[PDB]
């Protein structure tokens, strides 16, 4: 039950879930296209979600935490994959053993130093690293 945007884009939304306000440690999850690999949790926004209810929405079936909902850190676009995720910070206050992506799909977690996450993403998927990347292209 995807969406769009005004100009063809689908709508997703993804959020940068750190452990701390410090936003040193940020948790990255497994591939559903590709289990070998990491990624910053996110997926389509729904029939009608505001990007901060699919943000938080994703995370937790994705991730499985919850937390506060920092800023919108920007949209970011994918051109090999019609794409639109509005991408937000997210400070991590409930860390769940059971969320539904884990036991359903078999959706692994864990936390990377803001720099070895980017490491590992930029290989499969450049555009989550773009967001880290935003981070000190302030």
């Given at each position: 039950?995807?969406?769009y945007?005004?100009?063809?884009?689908?709508?997703?939304?993804?959020?940068?879930?750190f452990?701390?306000?410090?936003?040193?440690?940020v948790?990255?999850?497994?591939?559903?296209?590709?289990?070998?690999q990491?990624?910053?949790?996110?997926?389509?926004?729904?029939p009608?979600?505001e990007?901060?209810?699919?943000?938080?929405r994703?995370?937790?079936?994705?991730?499985?935490?919850?937390?506060?909902?920092?800023?919108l850190?920007?949209?970011f676009?994918?051109?090999?994959?019609k794409?639109?995720t509005?991408?937000y910070?997210?400070?991590?206050?409930?860390?769940?053993?059971?969320?539904?992506?884990?036991?359903?799909?078999?959706?692994?977690?864990?936390?990377?130093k803001?720099?070895?996450?980017i490491?590992?993403?930029?290989?499969?998927?450049?555009?989550?690293?773009?967001?880290?990347?935003?981070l000190?292209?302030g």
């Open positions: 039950t995807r969406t945007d005004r100009e063809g884009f689908k709508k997703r939304a993804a959020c940068l879930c452990r701390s306000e410090q936003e040193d440690e948790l990255l999850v497994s591939s559903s296209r590709y289990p070998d990491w990624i910053v949790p996110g997926g389509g926004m729904e009608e979600e990007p901060g209810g699919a943000a938080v994703e995370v937790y079936e994705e991730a499985g935490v919850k937390g506060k909902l920092g800023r850190l920007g949209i676009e994918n051109q090999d994959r794409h639109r509005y991408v910070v997210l400070t991590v206050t409930e860390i769940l053993e059971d969320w539904e992506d884990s036991v359903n799909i078999g959706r692994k977690r864990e936390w990377f803001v720099e070895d996450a490491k590992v993403l930029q290989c499969h998927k450049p555009v989550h690293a773009e967001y880290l990347e935003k000190k292209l």
